[PDB]
Q: What sequence folds into this?
């Protein structure tokens, strides 16, 4: 059991337990007033301060209040400033601070907290592992990598640090190098290693290198509840949504959108072509490490349900056209973008993040031959003026082996079986 | 991310909101 009472607190252990018993009993209002009195009588008490913060924490959960919780987050820190604070109490208070900071989206704050923790406990490997996550949550894979390298130099068989190290490696396109860490890290069974991200990226890493054992891991990931199936490997999912690789316009119910895209396809093309000719800079190279080779760029009109205003100044009639269809402009888990691929481009088999969207492709400029797209076990081609519809949460693959460039328009829609409340509540992706 | 799943986290947390 932890040692949370310094010698001073032991002289008031009776009052401390009385207050804590109230909170443990569930009487939060009067327990807060207890610890508040205790912090009043003994401002130098670390346990009275910690009990105040826990009660504020319990109050925030009850009222579902972020503001109340931010109070607790500050009180957790004050514990650290008081005289002669027991190590167990200090670590417990700053860890909950960081945890709650992450809960609120204060990732920069959680990071500073984790950094202070690591200095106060340089032998605690778990705090380093947690620090690495702090860096990952901000997108700082460089400092995150250093952290896990400093962990594995001391504890090289910690699986938690292995999977996170391998994840960072594959993110950096160290395909072969990431496979052992990801594999060994999952095989350890350590807490935190049973994460669909590692199964996903392990198998995908194997695919790229040719290791046919990948689908053995995909199946395992399906057994552990990460993937809806071996072929549909998205991780941000609403369970129960109809799952099939290819849809028809009628099956989606978005038939007025499909009609509007197909009837006005030349307009959509010409505005895309005009941006290509007069503003190539608005087309951005694919930057998700999905290409084996070739030229692939995208010009994005909508993302996360946000209209890109400068992009729409280059395709203004197309954006206006699309505004009549909230099923796609309001899709906060998809995009609306032009997509150009040049000859000699192969796109790795990959999967989208979420099964809450369906992906329409409107063909704009389709070379007579060389271009095709696979989703799951069906390969199809594009047609100028025609819409394809597939679920990109299924594995899909693309080839551009033509003599000239290939332009399409990509329009994501909410999965039709999603309710209006889910379309307004799901966090953006 | 957008077309793939190569980032540690894709969503943002906002407490109880
Ligand atoms: O735009 C392309 O040519 C390839 N498209 C995709 O991979 C997709 O829409 O998910
Ligand atoms: Mn794709």
A:
């Amino acid at each position: 059991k932890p040692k949370l009472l310094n010698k001073f607190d032991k002289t008031i252990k009776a009052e401390l337990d009385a207050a804590e018993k109230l909170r443990k009993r569930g009487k939060i209002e009067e327990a807060v007033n207890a610890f508040k009195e205790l912090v009043r009588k003994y401002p130098q008490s670390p346990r009275a301060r910690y009990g105040k913060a826990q009660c504020e924490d319990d109050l925030a959960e009850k009222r579902r209040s972020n503001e109340v919780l931010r109070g607790a987050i500050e009180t957790y820190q004050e514990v650290a400033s008081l005289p002669d604070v027991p190590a167990d109490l200090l670590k417990l208070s700053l860890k909950r601070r960081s945890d709650r900071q992450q809960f609120l989206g204060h990732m920069r704050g959680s990071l500073l907290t984790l950094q202070r923790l690591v200095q106060l406990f340089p032998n605690d490997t778990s705090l380093k592992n947690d620090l690495g996550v702090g860096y990952l949550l901000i997108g700082d894979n460089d400092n995150a990598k250093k952290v896990y390298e400093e962990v594995l130099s001391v504890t090289p068989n910690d699986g938690f640090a292995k999977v996170h190290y391998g994840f960072i490696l594959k993110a950096q396109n160290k395909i072969a190098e990431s496979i052992p860490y990801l594999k060994e890290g999952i095989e350890s069974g350590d807490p935190g290693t049973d994460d669909g991200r590692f199964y996903f990226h392990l198998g995908d890493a194997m695919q790229r290198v040719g290791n046919k054992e990948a689908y053995k891991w995909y199946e395992l990931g399906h057994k552990r509840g990460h993937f809806a199936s071996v072929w549909q490997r998205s991780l941000y999912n609403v369970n129960g949504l109809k799952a099939q690789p290819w849809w028809t316009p009628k099956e989606t119910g978005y038939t007025e959108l499909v009609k509007s895209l197909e009837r006005n396809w030349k307009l959509i093309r010409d505005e895309g072509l005009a941006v290509m000719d007069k503003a190539k800079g608005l087309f951005l190279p694919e930057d998700e490490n999905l290409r084996e080779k070739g030229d692939w760029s995208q010009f994005t009109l909508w993302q996360q349900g946000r209209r890109n205003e400068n992009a729409c100044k280059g395709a203004p009639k197309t954006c206006t056209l699309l505004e009549k269809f909230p099923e796609t402009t309001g899709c906060r888990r998809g995009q609306i973008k032009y997509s150009i691929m040049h000859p000699g481009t192969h796109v790795w088999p990959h999967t989208g993040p979420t099964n809450c969207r369906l992906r329409m492709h409107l063909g704009l400029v389709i070379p007579k031959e060389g271009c095709k797209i696979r989703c799951a076990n069906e390969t199809k081609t594009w047609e100028e003026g025609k819409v394809l519809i597939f679920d990109d949460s299924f594995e899909h693959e693309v080839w551009q082996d033509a003599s000239s460039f290939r332009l399409i328009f990509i329009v994501d829609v909410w999965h039709p079986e999603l309710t209006p409340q889910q379309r307004r509540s799901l966090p953006a992706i | 991310x957008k077309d793939g799943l190569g980032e540690y986290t894709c969503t943002s947390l906002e407490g109880f909101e």
In short: The radius of gyration of chain B is 10 Å. DSSP finds no helices and no strands in chain B. Chain B touches chain A at residues 1-17 (CB under 8 Å).
